[PDB]
Paper text:
Of particular interest, transient overexpression of the G556V mutation, near the helical kink in TM6, in tobacco epidermal cells resulted in a well-expressed protein as assessed by confocal imaging and the planta cell death assay. However, recordings from excised membrane patches showed no detectable currents of G556V under applied tension, indicating that the mutation stabilizes a non-conducting conformation. To better understand the open-to-closed transition of AtMSL10, we determined the cryo-EM structure of G556V at a nominal resolution of ~3.5 Å. The global structure of G556V is almost identical to that of the wild type (r.m.s.d of ~1.1 Å for all Cα atoms). Importantly, pronounced local conformational changes occur at the F553 hydrophobic gate, though the pore-lining helices align well with those of the wild type and the helical kinks are maintained. Introduction of a bulkier hydrophobic residue, valine, at the position of G556 pushes the aromatic side chain of F553 toward the central pore axis. Consequently, reorientation of the phenylalanine side chain reduces the pore radius from 6.6 to 3.9 Å at the position of the F553 ring, which is now remarkably similar to the dimension of the corresponding F572 ring in the wild-type DmMSL10/FLYC1 structure (3.5 Å in radius). Together with the lack of activating currents of the G556V variant in excised membrane patches, we conclude that this conformation represents a non-conducting, closed state. The wild-type AtMSL10 structure has a wide-open pore, whereas a non-conducting mutant G556V renders a much narrower pore created by repositioning of the side chain of F553, which appears to constitute the hydrophobic gate in the closed state. Closure of the channel pore could be essentially accomplished by local adjustment of the side chain of a critical residue defining the narrowest pore, while the global conformations of the open and closed states are similar.
Amongst the Arabidopsis MSL channels, MSL10 is enigmatic in that it has two separable functional modalities, regulated cell death signaling conferred by its N-terminal soluble ‘death’ domain and force-activated ion channel activity imparted by its C-terminal portion. When heterologously expressed in Xenopus oocytes, MSL10 is indeed activated by membrane stretch and displays a preference for anions. In Arabidopsis, MSL10 is primarily expressed in the shoot apex, root tips, and vascular tissues, playing a critical role in adaptation to hypo-osmotic shock and induction of programmed cell death. Analogous to DmMSL10/FLYC1, each subunit of the heptameric AtMSL10 channel is composed of a transmembrane domain (TMD) with six membrane-spanning helices (TM1-TM6) and a characteristic C-terminal cytoplasmic domain (CTD) shared by all MscS homologs.
Residue numbers in the entry:
A (entry chain A): 248 to 334, 387 to 396, 432 to 468, 481 to 731
B (entry chain B): 495 to 643
C (entry chain B): 693 to 731
Write the structure that this text describes.
């Protein structure tokens, strides 16, 4: 649309100028009218060019985010379409795109059939497609997770669109004002002295808005160029976990572990580290415990072997890789060790991570109980008088 | 090691490509304005207004351009670390994953993805484990003061 | 220090060795003596 409008306007301008190229003095007053009309025509041509460059910049930024945005959106849309079948154009489709879902999935599955109904999948999609897409409870949980991810992606796309709309409004405003002053100067309505006074006034206005414009522009740079996080991704700022809710040009709505709505200025975040849980790979975990310094090494070896067997017998929660280490020895009374393990998921699922950590702690406590490991304080002697 | 070197080379190539894109953009715009001025299509008054507008734009992008340029200086001239090398920043070990003109992806001991601005790192010490020689270790223990020598 | 796992394992082995060595040498630590008088 932008290029069509630009070509139409340029063609009209050249047709008019070529037709009016004749040097005929119809009337002294008509010359001023023609000059004003051509000045307005060139001013609107400049405005159209400014609009074209604005939309070009907006589109390039939108596509820079949209590579990943539309990749995720297309994945979610394909998953949702497959689920529904079992039960640009891409941007519009993405924009258009629980207990009820679980009930629907259960109804589709054959009664008293925990495993996924192969016949139902075959009748709805090829066997290879069904296998690639792929317990009734597990299937329902996966469907719910997919729906939640699709909803989060849609919300993130809506937030990005709102931010882009705000930036577009700001850019449009500035380009209207600049083209208006361009037209006013081109019409030479006012004299030069007042023009210079207005130039000085604009300089003073810029000197006044120095801080605000600088902060806003660096906020745009941080939001777009850096792109450290997206909507729906949990992040740690100043060592405290915080969940992103909505992003603006100067305000970023955050939700803490206790659903605390915090407005964090974008400019400040540009000077602080940002950690993203969603983009990070499988995360680790550390458990701290202490045991008596006098325990035989055989007990330590048995504890390590039992920890290894417990970790390997539950691959769904912890990876086989693990390590048992000793931090330091103080007073040779208690030994400081930490158990390192890798979770099968990230830190985004705070509840699941906490439950798994609690289960691991209870298991470690039981294991220490069976091994008969006790800790005693330093002996103390008392002499009576 | 070969895979890590290949990944580091790819990251450096991507950073160089981003810098090349930025430089190309600026040179296109400067040559476009050069051509427009050389064709004297517009008058001088509007030319001066555009010059003032460009001055205002520079005064607005002061902070961002300064930060970006010092980030390039830090990435290239200083060259304190490469991809795949573990480094300690603010006393905490951190592993470099990918380097950009303004963002540096880092992985902590717990695979924590942290985006550290390049400008901030220019004012903090950086320690590189990969380039350092064989490292030492300290073990702390205490024993009774009355033990014979 | 790049190989964090290997470094930690070696440090743990060294700590266990030091603990064993102290055990064989019969080295013990005792707190400051304390006197108590009854009324």
């Amino acid at each position: 649309k932008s290029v069509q409008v630009f070509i139409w306007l340029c063609l009209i301008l050249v047709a008019w100028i070529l037709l009016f190229n004749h040097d005929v003095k119809r009337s002294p007053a008509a010359t001023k009218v023609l000059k004003c009309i051509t000045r307005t025509l060139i001013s609107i041509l400049t405005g159209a060019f400014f609009w074209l460059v604005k939309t070009l910049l907006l589109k390039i930024l939108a596509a820079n985010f949209n590579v990943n945005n539309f990749f995720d959106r297309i994945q979610d849309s394909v998953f949702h379409q497959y689920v529904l079948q079992t039960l640009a154009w891409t941007m519009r489709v993405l924009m258009e795109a629980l207990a009820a879902a679980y009930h629907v999935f259960r109804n589709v599955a054959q009664p008293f059939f925990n495993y996924i109904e192969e016949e139902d999948l075959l009748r709805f999609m090829i066997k290879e497609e069904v296998d690639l897409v792929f317990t009734r409870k597990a299937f329902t949980e996966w469907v719910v997770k997919v729906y939640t991810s699709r909803r989060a992606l849609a919300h993130s796309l809506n937030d990005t669109k709102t931010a882009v709309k705000q930036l577009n409004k700001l850019v449009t405003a500035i380009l209207m004002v600049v083209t208006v002053v361009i037209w006013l100067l081109l019409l030479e309505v006012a004299t030069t002295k007042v023009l210079l006074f207005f130039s000085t006034q604009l300089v003073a206005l810029a000197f006044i808005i120095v801080s605000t414009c600088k902060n806003l522009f660096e906020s745009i740079v941080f939001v777009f160029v850096m792109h450290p996080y997206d909507v729906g991704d949990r992040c740690v700022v100043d060592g405290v976990a915080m969940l992103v809710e909505e992003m603006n040009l100067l305000t970023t709505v955050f939700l803490k572990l206790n659903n605390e709505k915090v407005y964090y200025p974008n400019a400040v975040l540009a000077t602080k580290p940002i950690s993203n849980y969603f983009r990070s790979p499988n995360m680790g975990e550390t458990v701290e415990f202490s045991i008596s310094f006098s325990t035989p090494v055989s007990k330590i070896a048995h504890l390590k072997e039992r920890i290894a067997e417990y970790l390997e017998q539950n691959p769904q929660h912890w990876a086989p890789v693990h390590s048992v280490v000793v931090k330091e020895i103080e007073n040779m009374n208690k030994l400081k060790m930490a158990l390192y393990s890798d979770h099968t998921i990230t830190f985004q699922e705070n509840r699941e991570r906490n439950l798994r950590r609690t289960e691991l702690s209870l298991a470690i406590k039981r294991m220490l109980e069976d091994l008969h490991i006790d800790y005693t304080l330093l002996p103390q002697d008392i002499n009576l008088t």
